[PDB]
Design a protein around this ligand. Structure first.
Ligand SMILES: N[C@@H](CCC(=O)N[C@@H](CS)C(=O)NCC(=O)O)C(=O)O
Ligand SMILES: N[C@@H](CCC(=O)N[C@@H](CS)C(=O)NCC(=O)O)C(=O)O
Lengths: 217, 217
């Protein structure tokens, strides 16, 4: 079957796993475990990294027969394309593109400070600027059920992950934005998502790798 | 007319300008100038940032009537969609997605060290790992005229920029990869690209902003 390869954590594979579940995809997971400190041994992956037929060897990767895909966003698009979750109208597509790139940006910013050895010192400013970021997603969604419009697309999975990672980081961060909380309920309320979250497959944490200062476990 | 807003440099607007020229698009450019050190005044942009109707205020941005778009890759997709430069077959689309994200990754890596105050110290390792990166693009392209296959797509503009930024950074870096050099000749050899590169509009540098340690001018 289709196979998703990634570290034995949540990370960049989260939205992918969620999408694979929602779309009722047939897949397996090749999990790689990173060694503990001080080495943080990555040989489980490196000893196989160049033996998978990947053009740009990376994690996560998705193998679907002849198709070997890397780059998290690329994997999401590939799956989304099979289930018409890419956006149909021009307005939807524009929203999808912006979010696809916007979410990764916001994701990176969280990861940047969390892996930074000086995490505790940088945290105050990040939390200071966080409401501003969240408000943008809030205003962008508006009264829409989903981010691209009235139908769900793959970017909802990406935004869900960004919003979720933040409620975990700062529990009260979504309180000022009721529509964002409702988005989360509506998403988690999806039949196939609800079922997956209650299963043994669900892996909401560790958020980041063992090398992280926050969310490393 | 359509308007592209960005700093008065090359940066993330390069592939966009090139695409706009190749597609024969009607556009203007709102250039923002950053102040010199030590302040690096960004008020020319900030004083207008939230007055443009952008959902996630950022640079570059593209205003096309009712459409206000941010995120460089989103802008490229928007323009590409109008001129059937997104990829048609499934294999082309997969290549486009991987490259769209891959190029940004490699682009970020260059920018990370170039803006880093310790640029000179980090440079040795980056140059050591550079051949590896370039070889991946080389093998990926193979004997294809363009990166997605036989027809040109918007990712060729992104790969061109990544390759070009590196020949500027390390002149001999593409020597070991003849097909990459041929790709550059073929791209620059495009009639509308050739014409633009010879015009007053062409802005190949500064590569990065004034805050950069390398390519700041
Ligand atoms: N932009 C890539 C990032 C991939 C990446 O950075 N993967 C990390 C884990 S978060 C990794 O361990 N890659 C394998 C390697 O470095 O060889 C994506 O979205 O997939
Ligand atoms: N991933 C984004 C990055 C956007 C970004 O970082 N833009 C910088 C310049 S390289 C900027 O000055 N943005 C305006 C701002 O921060 O207010 C893209 O590709 O457009």
């Amino acid at each position: 079957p289709m196979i998703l390869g990634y570290w034995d954590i949540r990370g960049l594979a989260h939205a992918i796993r969620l999408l694979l579940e929602y779309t009722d995809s047939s897949y397996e997971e090749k999990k790689y475990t990173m060694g503990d400190a001080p080495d943080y041994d990555r040989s489980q992956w490196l000893n196989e990294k160049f033996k998978l037929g990947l053009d740009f060897p990376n994690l996560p990767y998705l193998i679907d027969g002849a198709h070997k895909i890397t780059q998290s966003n690329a994997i999401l698009c590939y799956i989304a394309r099979k289930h018409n979750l890419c956006g149909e109208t021009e307005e939807e597509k524009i929203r999808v593109d912006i979010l696809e790139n916007q979410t990764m940006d916001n994701h990176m910013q969280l990861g940047m400070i969390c892996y930074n050895p000086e995490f505790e010192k940088l945290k105050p400013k990040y939390l200071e600027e966080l409401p501003e970021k969240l408000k943008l997603y809030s205003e962008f969604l508006g009264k829409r059920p989903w981010f691209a419009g009235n139908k769900i697309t793959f970017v909802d999975f990406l935004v869900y992950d960004v919003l979720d990672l933040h409620r975990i980081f700062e529990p009260k961060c979504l309180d000022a934005f009721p529509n964002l909380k409702d988005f989360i309920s509506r998403f988690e309320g999806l039949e196939k998502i609800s079922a997956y979250m209650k299963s043994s497959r669900f892996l909401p944490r560790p958020v980041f790798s063992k090398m992280a200062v926050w969310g490393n476990k």
